[PDB]
Amino acid sequence: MKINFSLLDEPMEVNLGTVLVIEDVSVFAQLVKEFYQYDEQSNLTIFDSKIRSIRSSELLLITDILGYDINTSQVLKLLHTDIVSQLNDKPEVRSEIDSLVSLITDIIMAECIENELDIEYDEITLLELIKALGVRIETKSCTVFEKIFEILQIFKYLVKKRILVFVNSLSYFSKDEIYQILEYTKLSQADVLFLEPRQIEGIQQFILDKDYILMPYNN
Amino acid sequence: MKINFSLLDEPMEVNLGTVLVIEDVSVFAQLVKEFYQYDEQSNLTIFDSKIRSIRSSELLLITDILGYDINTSQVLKLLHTDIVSQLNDKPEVRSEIDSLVSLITDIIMAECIENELDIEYDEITLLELIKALGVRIETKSCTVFEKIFEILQIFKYLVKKRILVFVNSLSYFSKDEIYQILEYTKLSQADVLFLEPRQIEGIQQFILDKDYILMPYN
Amino acid sequence: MKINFSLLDEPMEVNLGTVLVIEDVSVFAQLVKEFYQYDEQSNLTIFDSKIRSIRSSELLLITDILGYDINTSQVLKLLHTDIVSQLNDKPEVRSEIDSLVSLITDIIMAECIENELDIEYDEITLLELIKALGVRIETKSCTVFEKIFEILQIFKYLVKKRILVFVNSLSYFSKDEIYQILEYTKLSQADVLFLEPRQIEGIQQFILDKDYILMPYNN
Amino acid sequence: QVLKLLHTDIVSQLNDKPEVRSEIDSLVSLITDIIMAECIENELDIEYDEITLLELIKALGVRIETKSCTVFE
Amino acid sequence: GWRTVVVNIHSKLSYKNNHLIFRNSYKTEMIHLSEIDILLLETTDIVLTTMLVKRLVDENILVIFCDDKRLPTAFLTPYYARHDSSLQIARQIAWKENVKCEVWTAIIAQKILNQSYYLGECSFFEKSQSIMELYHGLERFDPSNREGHSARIYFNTLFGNDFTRESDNDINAALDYGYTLLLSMFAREVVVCGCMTQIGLKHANQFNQFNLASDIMEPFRPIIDRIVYQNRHNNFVKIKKELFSIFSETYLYNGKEMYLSNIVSDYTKKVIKALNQLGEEIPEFRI
Amino acid sequence: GWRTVVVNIHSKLSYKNNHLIFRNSYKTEMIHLSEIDILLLETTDIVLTTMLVKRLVDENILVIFCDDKRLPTAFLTPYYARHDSSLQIARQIAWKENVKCEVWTAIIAQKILNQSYYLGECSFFEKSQSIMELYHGLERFDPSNREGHSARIYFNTLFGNDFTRESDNDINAALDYGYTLLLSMFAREVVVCGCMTQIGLKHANQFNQFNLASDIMEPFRPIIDRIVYQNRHNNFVKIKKELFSIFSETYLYNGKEMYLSNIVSDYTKKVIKALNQLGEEIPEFRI
Amino acid sequence: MRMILMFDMPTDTAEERKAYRKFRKFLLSEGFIMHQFSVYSKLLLNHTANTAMVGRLKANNPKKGNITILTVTEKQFARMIYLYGEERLVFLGDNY
Amino acid sequence: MRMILMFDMPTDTAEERKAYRKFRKFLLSEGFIMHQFSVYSKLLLNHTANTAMVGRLKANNPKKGNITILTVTEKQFARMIYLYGEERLVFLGDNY
Ligand SMILES: [Ca+2]
Ligand SMILES: [Ca+2]
Ligand SMILES: [Ca+2]
Ligand SMILES: [Ca+2]
Known part of the structure; x- marks a missing residue:
């Protein structure tokens, strides 16, 4: 997952988490505007190993952390499917749940037989039980750090998003929290690209000087 | 208008443009959390000149400048209602509009009578004409400097919002652009408050030290 | 790009080049058979960061290096497009080629006007000139090392292949040639997985003991 | 068959003039040198054969005019 | 280019x-x-x-x-x-003092003649007549220093008697600027010829890397003196821009009208060829 | 500094x-x-x-x-x-022919001595004894041409009697590659000294522009021919890979075991200082 | 609304040339100015006069005639660059 | 930036016609589409590509050729309307 712009000499590769610091406010604002307008502008080009350019629908752009909606129909559906798989991996728990919903089905069936009208039904499944429970992620009481962590957790659930990009999101988190975010990103394998005006101390990042020189920086 | 939290000794007043710098990352992130949770949490408070607490509906919180849509259902509703009021303030112009709409309705009605299928119609209204024309605020923004200006225009247009708050939005604009934004805020009289993790050189701002003491700068 | 089988405790990630050494002949032959039959068998599961399982059409399996055909219609077409892009990146060379093609078109047009029949034509383009030249990769005189290198070069041209896998291909190459293959794979960013019965000395690899214990090995 | 006889006829007309065909061979040699240099610049090995006048005519798409307004034409 | x-x-x-x-x-x-x-x-x-x-x-x-x-x-x-x-270095070491003093004397004669032509175009009969007298009085080894006297009378007549070359005024600053640009172009031409730039054709005692390029650039100084004389009232920035307009302007060589870079290249080529061939022909540049 | x-x-x-x-x-x-x-x-x-x-x-x-x-x-x-x-280049222009002939003869003697010593390490006593006899027979002005006579003996001993420098083969291309790397290092050292590389120590042939560095790098030449002799069976690419390791490999200078860059630097500095001071000491390098 | 209008038609026949002259005279009578051959423009007061002008132009278009119409702002009209068919000193920086 | 381009030139001479064909082929090779004769347009990505295109058009302009360049918005470029074609005596028949 390499990104390239006219200011760079060679296309830079983005693997796992990547912290890109732009020391020039003009090039930073122009790059962010090229991130929002990316479908319209040909200056910023992001391509994969196949050299194929990714569509703006495949690109995931995030600026406001707490304003973004983490709960979507696809995210909640795939999450319910993941929970159903977790319950399916354990035979004993699945057997017990089958017994409980089974007994409930017996009761409701008796109540239906007591009625004068002829009533038919099918089944009460686990996905219907989860949908009836209303399982969803809670962003209401979550701190910004837990919000970005939940975004990194649900990025695997998003199928269409090729790369996640954060705009000036590293100013809220402490150095240790940034270390946790990067260390978790290395395990999640997702491609995250952070854009900050000022460099963060203690983490590996790519620095773009006002001279338009891109250099790797350990601190 | 003034804002008050447990960290400050006394509530600080926010008049015209205001730049607030928080030198503690924990107090800054917790402060933004208190901004988004303001309805849920009672810690952060805001007291106007009347010394009355304001609901979160009156507070306008904008973090991403480019990601904030200028065209909304409520904004288009208030704009269409405003144009309808302006057209209602002039009886003659609205009368001419009623005459033209009557002519168009007569033509389309004649074409409907010419058809072999029965057709039923109701009427045409000025609101349906405005919505049919697609009246909306200009969506063209070249840079974030212009987009924030449109946000200030729509904020000054909205009467219900008593305060506009930007979180880390000053990092995109150059110092000169910050001066133009402050001058435009002083000319527009609107109340704008900025929250920055680090201090900005050359402009007047309130610096909150890690010791929690607040000091003026420039 | 993580691959997982029943013998492994956790799914192992494959990034850039990866050398997997199976010390047990039974598990190695069974794993290779599961590589050829992969669509039929559910034991071996290869998934990306999205956890989505890749189809056998997306998987590229290679055992015989010299028997594989590197020249295909899609590979030659995309290669001709790449050459056309290389000629398009230079304005002067493209201008000269346009001049020569203009001269030839003038000659052929004069010859057409000399004929009694009414003749019409369109243009002679650069892609038609390359197709008339018959540009293709030469595997005839190539050594096995140059053949595998050309395969790593054309893997970027293949759009549908998600991952390239080689079966016992490291026995022919010397240690230095293996170092060149890995160092080139790190630059090409492609995902290559090698399967060898015996461990190679001097390169980082994942070793599977007869005890079915997977351990990282620097040498 | 019509395009084969037409292309063969044009090839015969170009073969009747040695100087013009010589100039065509020179230009084709220059283009082959340029494309060959671009192929050598690439990191992948490339093998080529040659370019012929028949391949140039077929690449140009020489054919009789297909425009007919009426059945009389 | x-x-x-x-x-x-x-x-x-x-x-x-x-x-x-x-x-x-x-x-x-x-x-x-x-x-x-x-x-x-x-x-x-x-x-x-x-x-x-x-x-x-x-x-x-x-x-x-x-x-x-x-x-x-x-x-x-x-x-x-x-x-x-590398082959020209041996010829430069094999050069003769008679050829160096002869070519340098002819070049100084061309420079003084160009100054007399500039004063003649400026309609000064006594000054151009005196500079022409110094041109007719120039001799080998320069015992009379008629070149330095021609420069002193040239600048003193153009800019006034109170003017001097040792002044810090923007006039001398622009003169040294144009001499630095023309010295850079002529030095680059000498680098194209390959001969050593530090070896001069006039004084073997003076050791400077720009000596040869200065001796070759001597006849072209009056071209800078003209624009410096016209723009002397303008600010140093506008004078620098007018000095940059010299590259866009064209001058008439004896053969035809050419650009300054081509005249400097061909002139340096004829000078090097004349030095290696021991004064076959001396290129003459006139305003 | x-x-x-x-x-x-x-x-x-x-x-x-x-x-x-x-x-x-x-x-x-x-x-x-x-x-x-x-x-x-x-x-x-x-x-x-x-x-x-x-x-x-x-x-x-x-x-x-x-x-x-x-x-x-x-x-x-x-x-x-x-x-x-730039002030030091004038002394290089002043280099005497006696000092140039002395340094050149010493360099040829060092190269021939290194070739004979390398043949002794390869356990050919007749060829090394012949090259040593030519080394003891070398004289100024080179009337005997014992260097060109020792060449054929050295190459014929190394790669066989059928091998020659004129033939086109991966061995000759490898020798030109190693001589190109050594010419780059020694040329960089001469450029660090500031002396013009166009002026050579050999008075006969000025054709090459690197003549100074090409003459200074001769005593280190056989170290390339050793690796070229060991790797001669390998392809030219493998010979280039083996010759690329000479920069990492350490060699024995007379004073102490050092890297090739420092040895070439000290040798070049001693050569330049000896040429300006007219033969105070001649740096000697032995394999 | 700035109305840019391009006009073309086969001119070979005499009737076609007469129709071209008639259409050009009609464009001049309607307030359009010819910047160059086939290039014209007119300033329309509002969208009403623009629509009526579009209808009139469709009615007055000669046989085989072709008209291109574009709506342009004053800032875009002042940015119109007309080139009618090599610098020694190139300056990248302040132009002095 | 939507670039509207008009092109005209005297076509009488054979060299002028050849130059017109060459310039038109150059316009087609650069991405411009011909809506009608002398009428062309091309969509430029930004202002830099527009300036470079202006310089290239000035360099490729044939002798006596005249080019009119106008900037129009993409939405205004879509607003382009192409019209392709009061008499007392109407004659349907021979025109006498
Ligand atoms: Ca159900
Ligand atoms: Ca519920
Ligand atoms: Ca062919
Ligand atoms: Ca064709």
């Missing part, structure tokens, strides 16, 4: 596909290297790559680096411009 | 607070301006700033640029306050 590119703005320069790449935040522009003759960097905020410097050395393009005051600081000198340099 | 700063890696250079900032991917180093003496850039990926170039003009430090072949191409020439190397 035909084009003098001057960069006074901060930006980054790269070399891509035989093309000079000018990259800045506001805009990016690509200029081919074959069209570029001279490259001038007038500010200290410009960035460049050593690969572009190597491509400029292979393209034989003069690169000039100025100071914060915009005055030229240091220019790039290639070690080997052509293989004929 | 004293320390000679050479940049062989990709990096960027800046100037802040009278401090040169060198930035590479591994680490950042800051060097005081007064400590630096000569600055050389080995590769084409180095990035520099014109402000640092102006500070170097004020500091008089010599800036050396190199191409991808590592051969020095251009150097920075200031208009004022020139470096002392």
Whole structure:
């Protein structure tokens, strides 16, 4: 997952988490505007190993952390499917749940037989039980750090998003929290690209000087 | 208008443009959390000149400048209602509009009578004409400097919002652009408050030290 | 790009080049058979960061290096497009080629006007000139090392292949040639997985003991 | 068959003039040198054969005019 | 190259596909290297790559680096411009003092004659007649110093008796600026010829790297003196721009009307050929 | 200054607070301006700033640029306050023929002695004894041509009687490759000394522009022929890979075991200082 | 609304040339100015006069005639660059 | 930036016609589409590509050729309307 712009000499590769610091406010604002307008502008080009350019629908752009909606129909559906798989991996728990919903089905069936009208039904499944429970992620009481962590957790659930990009999101988190975010990103394998005006101390990042020189920086 | 939290000794007043710098990352992130949770949490408070607490509906919180849509259902509703009021303030112009709409309705009605299928119609209204024309605020923004200006225009247009708050939005604009934004805020009289993790050189701002003491700068 | 089988405790990630050494002949032959039959068998599961399982059409399996055909219609077409892009990146060379093609078109047009029949034509383009030249990769005189290198070069041209896998291909190459293959794979960013019965000395690899214990090995 | 006889006829007309065909061979040699240099610049090995006048005519798409307004034409 | 590119703005320069790449935040522009003759960097905020410097050395393009005051600081000198340099060094060591003093005397005669032509075009009969008398009185070894007297009377007549070459005024600053630019172009031409620039054709005691290029650039000084005399009332910036207009303007060589760079190149070529052939023909440049 | 700063890696250079900032991917180093003496850039990926170039003009430090072949191409020439190397070139123009013949004869004697010693290490006593006899028979002006006679014996001993330098083979191309690398190193050292490489120690042939460095690198030539003899069966690519390890390999100087760069540096410095001082001591190198 | 209008038609026949002259005279009578051959423009007061002008132009278009119409702002009209068919000194920086 | 381009030139001479064909082929090779004769347009990505295109058009302009360049918005470029074609005596028949 390499990104390239006219200011760079060679296309830079983005693997796992990547912290890109732009020391020039003009090039930073122009790059962010090229991130929002990316479908319209040909200056910023992001391509994969196949050299194929990714569509703006495949690109995931995030600026406001707490304003973004983490709960979507696809995210909640795939999450319910993941929970159903977790319950399916354990035979004993699945057997017990089958017994409980089974007994409930017996009761409701008796109540239906007591009625004068002829009533038919099918089944009460686990996905219907989860949908009836209303399982969803809670962003209401979550701190910004837990919000970005939940975004990194649900990025695997998003199928269409090729790369996640954060705009000036590293100013809220402490150095240790940034270390946790990067260390978790290395395990999640997702491609995250952070854009900050000022460099963060203690983490590996790519620095773009006002001279338009891109250099790797350990601190 | 003034804002008050447990960290400050006394509530600080926010008049015209205001730049607030928080030198503690924990107090800054917790402060933004208190901004988004303001309805849920009672810690952060805001007291106007009347010394009355304001609901979160009156507070306008904008973090991403480019990601904030200028065209909304409520904004288009208030704009269409405003144009309808302006057209209602002039009886003659609205009368001419009623005459033209009557002519168009007569033509389309004649074409409907010419058809072999029965057709039923109701009427045409000025609101349906405005919505049919697609009246909306200009969506063209070249840079974030212009987009924030449109946000200030729509904020000054909205009467219900008593305060506009930007979180880390000053990092995109150059110092000169910050001066133009402050001058435009002083000319527009609107109340704008900025929250920055680090201090900005050359402009007047309130610096909150890690010791929690607040000091003026420039 | 993580691959997982029943013998492994956790799914192992494959990034850039990866050398997997199976010390047990039974598990190695069974794993290779599961590589050829992969669509039929559910034991071996290869998934990306999205956890989505890749189809056998997306998987590229290679055992015989010299028997594989590197020249295909899609590979030659995309290669001709790449050459056309290389000629398009230079304005002067493209201008000269346009001049020569203009001269030839003038000659052929004069010859057409000399004929009694009414003749019409369109243009002679650069892609038609390359197709008339018959540009293709030469595997005839190539050594096995140059053949595998050309395969790593054309893997970027293949759009549908998600991952390239080689079966016992490291026995022919010397240690230095293996170092060149890995160092080139790190630059090409492609995902290559090698399967060898015996461990190679001097390169980082994942070793599977007869005890079915997977351990990282620097040498 | 019509395009084969037409292309063969044009090839015969170009073969009747040695100087013009010589100039065509020179230009084709220059283009082959340029494309060959671009192929050598690439990191992948490339093998080529040659370019012929028949391949140039077929690449140009020489054919009789297909425009007919009426059945009389 | 035909084009003098001057960069006074901060930006980054790269070399891509035989093309000079000018990259800045506001805009990016690509200029081919074959069209570029001279490259001038007038500010200290410009960035460049050593690969572009190597491509400029292979393209034989003069690169000039100025100071914060915009005055030229240091220019790039290639070690080997052509293989004929190593063969020309033996000829330069084999040169004769009679050929050096003869060619230098003829060049000084051409410079004084050009000054008399400038004063004649300026309609000064006594001054151009006196400078012409010094031109007819010039002799080998220069015992009478008629060249320095011609310069003193030239500047004292043009700018007034109170004027002097040792003054710090912007007139002498622009004169030294034009002499530095013309000295840079002539020095680059001497680098193209391959002969040693430090060896002069007049005084073997004076040791300077610019001595030879100055001796070759002596006849062209009055061209700078004209624009300096016309723009003397204008500010130093406008005088510098008018000095930059000399590259765009064309001058009439004895053969035909040519550009300044072509006249300097052909003139230096005829001078080197005349030095190696022991005064076959002496190129003469007149205003 | 004293320390000679050479940049062989990709990096960027800046100037802040009278401090040169060198930035590479591994680490950042800051060097005081007064400590630096000569600055050389080995590769084409180095990035520099014109402000640092102006500070170097004020500091008089010599800036050396190199191409991808590592051969020095251009150097920075200031208009004022020139470096002392330009004053040192005049002594190279003053080099006497007796000193040049003495240093040349000593160099040929060192190369022939190294060839005979290497043949003794290869356990050929007749060929090494013959080359040693030609070494003891070498004389000034080279009437015997014992170097060209020792050549055929050395190559015929190494690669066989059928092998020759005129034939086209991977062995000859490998020898020209090693001689190209050694010519690049010795040429870089001569460029560091400031002496013009066009002036050679051999008075017969001025054709080559590298003649000085090509004459200085002769005593180290057989070290390449050893590896070329061991790897002769391998393909030219493998011979290039083996010859690329000579930079990492350490060799025995007369004083102490050192890297090839420091040995060539000390040898070149002793050669230049001996040529300017008219033969105080001749650096001797033995395999 | 700035109305840019391009006009073309085969001119070979005499009737076609007469129709071209008639259409050009009609464009001049309607307030359009000819910047160059086939290039014209007119300033329309509002969208009403623009629509009526579009209908009139469709009615007055000659046989085989072709008209291109574009709506342009004053800032875009002042940016119109007309080139009718090599610098020695190139300056990148302040133009002095 | 939507670039509207008009092109005209005297076509009488054979060299002028050849130059017109060459310039038209150059316009087609650069991405411009011909809506009608002398009428062309091309969509430029930004202002830099627009300036470079202006310089290229000035360089490729044939002798006596005249080019009119106008900037129009993409939405205004879609607003382009192409019309392709009061008499007392109407004659349907021979025109006498
Ligand atoms: Ca159900
Ligand atoms: Ca519920
Ligand atoms: Ca062919
Ligand atoms: Ca064709």
